[PDB]
Amino acid sequence: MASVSELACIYSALILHDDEVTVTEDKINALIKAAGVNVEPFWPGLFAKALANVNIGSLICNVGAGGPAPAAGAAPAGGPAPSTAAAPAEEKKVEAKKEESEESDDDMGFGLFD
Amino acid sequence: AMRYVASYLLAALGGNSSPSAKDIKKILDSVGIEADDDRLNKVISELNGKNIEDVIAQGIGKLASVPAGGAVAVSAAPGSAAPAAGSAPAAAEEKKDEKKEESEESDDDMGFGLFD
């Protein structure tokens, strides 16, 4: 390899990608300083003033245009988990006569139909 | 997903073909990023002496940044207060006059009593 300039700037770029850190001139310059490489201030300056909102793979073609980046999201799930049932309920209703009546006759052929 | 790969690249491309995990950390910490020493050395020992010139020349994809894994974010399991057997409600000041009612649903009370 010989493209150390754009290499360092690109590695610095993607290292500053989307973390607790910010994609800024100071930060690329700091990473380049941290490694001890040589890149012309044009790359770090341009990169820091051009990126900061340019997803990630963008930097592969930032010299031409770039492009978007697809994303995804996770959806929660669950459900009801029943436990135990039924409880002793000793009740009693006041009833004496059952299926009977204190009046009964022929009880048949009554004119109550249409 | 990104790791410490481009940080290794920072070390190597810096002009020092000698993987100092400390210096990978140094590059991460230089600007203020929460890098972990174990994780970085582990990915470094996974990448130890691998395709450097290749990852440099045509490997601008998965390099270095937020360490892959997610590290728990917005996630929980449905495990709240365990329900009672079915009786004993949580009344405000349940301490006044023991009351036995409990009438809702009944389906077979076993109908026994051989307890002796």
UniProtKB/Swiss-Prot annotation, chain A:
One of its GO terms (cellular component) is cytosol. The modification N-acetylalanine is found at residue 2. One of its GO terms (biological process) is translation. Ubiquitinated at Lys-92 and Lys-93 by RNF14 and RNF25 in response to ribosome collisions (ribosome stalling). There is a cross-link at residues 92-93 (Glycyl lysine isopeptide (Lys-Gly) (interchain with G-Cter in ubiquitin)). The keyword Phosphoprotein applies. The modification Phosphoserine is found at residue 101. The keyword Phosphoprotein applies. Residues 69-114 are annotated as: Disordered. Transmembrane segments: none annotated. CDD domains: Ribosomal_P1. Keywords: Acetylation, Isopeptide bond, Phosphoprotein, Ribonucleoprotein, Ribosomal protein, Ubl conjugation. Pfam families: Ribosomal_60s. One of its GO terms (molecular function) is structural constituent of ribosome. Residues 89-100 have a biased composition (Basic and acidic residues). Residues 69-88 have a biased composition (Low complexity). InterPro entries: P1/P2_N_sf, Ribosomal_P1/P2. Belongs to the eukaryotic ribosomal protein P1/P2 family. Heterodimer with RPLP2 at the lateral ribosomal stalk of the large ribosomal subunit. Plays an important role in the elongation step of protein synthesis. This is Large ribosomal subunit protein P1. It comes from Homo sapiens. The lineage of its organism: Eukaryota, Metazoa, Chordata, Craniata, Vertebrata.
Swiss-Prot record, chain B:
The modification N6-acetyllysine is found at residue 22. Disulfide bonds: none annotated. Keywords: Acetylation, Phosphoprotein, Ribonucleoprotein, Ribosomal protein. The modification N-acetylmethionine is found at residue 2. GO terms for molecular function: structural constituent of ribosome. The modification N6-succinyllysine is found at residue 22. Plays an important role in the elongation step of protein synthesis. Heterodimer with P1 at the lateral ribosomal stalk of the large ribosomal subunit. This is Large ribosomal subunit protein P2. The gene is RPLP2.
